[PDB]
Design a protein around this ligand. Structure first.
Ligand SMILES: [Mg+2]
Length: 49
RNA sequence: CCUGGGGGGGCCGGGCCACCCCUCCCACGGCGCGACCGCUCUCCCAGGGGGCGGGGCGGACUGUCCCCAGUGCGCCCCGG
């Protein structure tokens, strides 16, 4: 008797950045530089201590 | 003018260009001064370093781990 399908409400809400974005090349290179620089200090402290 | 013939000159004005004396517009060449669009780097500072910088509104992220230090992204107003 009622085969037709009604159109659902299109009303939506604002979107949030739910998923993490990719870090840029500058951020990746800064992470690499930090990992390189903060490694030598560990062995330096272990040697002088 | 020369020996009837031979040789040469002016008329025929007016109009255009141009030899000497001032302006207007296009195409091309360079320089200086302002506006519009896009993207951005040396001058600046406590040589090196901070790279395109200052501030704010918010979020996210990094460290064989000095709990402090450091880098992107969204928007807005300035600097170059
Ligand atoms: Mg010109």
């Amino acid at each position: 008797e009622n085969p037709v399908y009604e159109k659902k409400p299109k009303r939506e809400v604002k979107k949030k950045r739910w998923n993490r974005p990719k870090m840029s090349l500058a951020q990746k290179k800064d992470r690499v530089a930090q990992k390189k620089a903060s490694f030598l200090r560990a062995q330096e402290r272990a040697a002088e201590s």
